[PDB]
Amino acid sequence: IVGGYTCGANTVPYQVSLNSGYHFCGGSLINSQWVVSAAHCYKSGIQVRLGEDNINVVEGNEQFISASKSIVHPSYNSNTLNNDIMLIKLKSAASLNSRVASISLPTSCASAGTQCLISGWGNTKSSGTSYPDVLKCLKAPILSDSSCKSAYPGQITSNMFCAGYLEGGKDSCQGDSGGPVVCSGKLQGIVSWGSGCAQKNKPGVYTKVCNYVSWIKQTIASN
Numbered sequence: 052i053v054g055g056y057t058c059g060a061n062t063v064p065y066q067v068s069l070n071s072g073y074h075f076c077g078g079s080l081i082n083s084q085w086v087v088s089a090a091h092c093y094k095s096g097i098q099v100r101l102g103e104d105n106i107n108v109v110e111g112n113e114q115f116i117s118a119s120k121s122i123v124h125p126s127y128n129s130n131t132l133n134n135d136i137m138l139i140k141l142k143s144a145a146s147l148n149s150r151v152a153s154i155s156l157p158t159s160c161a162s163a164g165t166q167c168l169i170s171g172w173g174n175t176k177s178s179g180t181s182y183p184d185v186l187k188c189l190k191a192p193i194l195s196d197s198s199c200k201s202a203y204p205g206q207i208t209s210n211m212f213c214a215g216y217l218e219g220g221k222d223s224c225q226g227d228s229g230g231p232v233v234c235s236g237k238l239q240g241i242v243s244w245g246s247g248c249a250q251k252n253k254p255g256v257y258t259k260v261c262n263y264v265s266w267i268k269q270t271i272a273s274n
C-alpha cells in the first residue's frame with residue numbers, strides 16, 4: 052500500500068497473509084474455512100496466516116492454517132486478469148473472534164464514490180521498494196467505470212473496478228494482491244492489478260467481488 056497508513060494491529064480482522072515461506076499475497080477471510088484472494092496469487096502449498104499484524108514477528112494473535120485446496124475461478128484469464136479471484140480452503144477452521152473475523156460478501160455491487168478500505172503488506176513505494184512489516188491501510192473511493200476504462204483502455208472488464216486516486220500517490224501495490232477492498236463492511240474488491248503503483252491516472256484495479264458471490268457460495272457449498 053502506497054500512501055496509506057498503519058492500520059493498527061488486528062484492526063482488519065479478515066485480512067490474511069498468504070505465506071509460502073514468505074508473504075506473497077493478501078486474502079480475505081470470508082468464513083471460518085475459506086479465504087478469497089486473487090487468482091494470480093495462486094500457488095500450491097499456501098499457508099494462510101490470519102490474525103497478522105507484523106508478518107515478520109509472532110505477536111500472539113496469529114493463526115497459521117495450511118490451505119487444503121485452492122479453487123481458481125473457472126474463467127480466470129491470467130493474460131487479462133479477467134476473473135482474478137480464487138478461493139482457498141483452510142485445512143481447519145479458523146478460530147473467530149474480534150481479531151480474526153470473516154468479512155461479509157456483498158449482496159450488491161458498490162458504486163463509484165463509495166469509500167473503501169484497502170489493506171495489505173505490499174510495497175509502500177511507488178518508486179523503488181519498501182515492504183512494511185505491519186499491515187497498511189488505505190481509504191480509497193471506488194472510481195467510475197468510465198474513469199477506470201479511460202485510465203486503462205481496452206483492459207477493464209465488467210469484473211473489474213478501479214479504486215483510488217487519479218492524482219496518484221495512494222494505491223495498493225505489489226504484495227497487496229489478493230487482499231481486500233472492503234466498503235461499508237462488505238468485501239467488494241480484491242487487489243488485482245494496476246500499472247505500477249500510485250501512478251497518476253493509473254489507479255488500482257480490483258476484482259469486482261459482487262460478481263462472484265454466487266460462484267463463491269456455490270463453491271463453498273460443495274467443497
Ligand SMILES: N=C(N)c1ccc(/N=N/Nc2ccc(C(=N)N)cc2)cc1
Nearest residue numbers: 091223224225228244245247248255256
Ligand atoms: N493498485 C495497483 N497499482 C497494483 C496493485 C497490485 C499489483 N500487483 N499485482 N501484481 C501482480 C503480479 C503478478 C500477476 C500475474 N501473475 N499476472 C498479476 C499481478 C499491481 C498494481
Ligand SMILES: [Ca+2]
Nearest residue numbers: 105108109110
Ligand atoms: Ca505476526
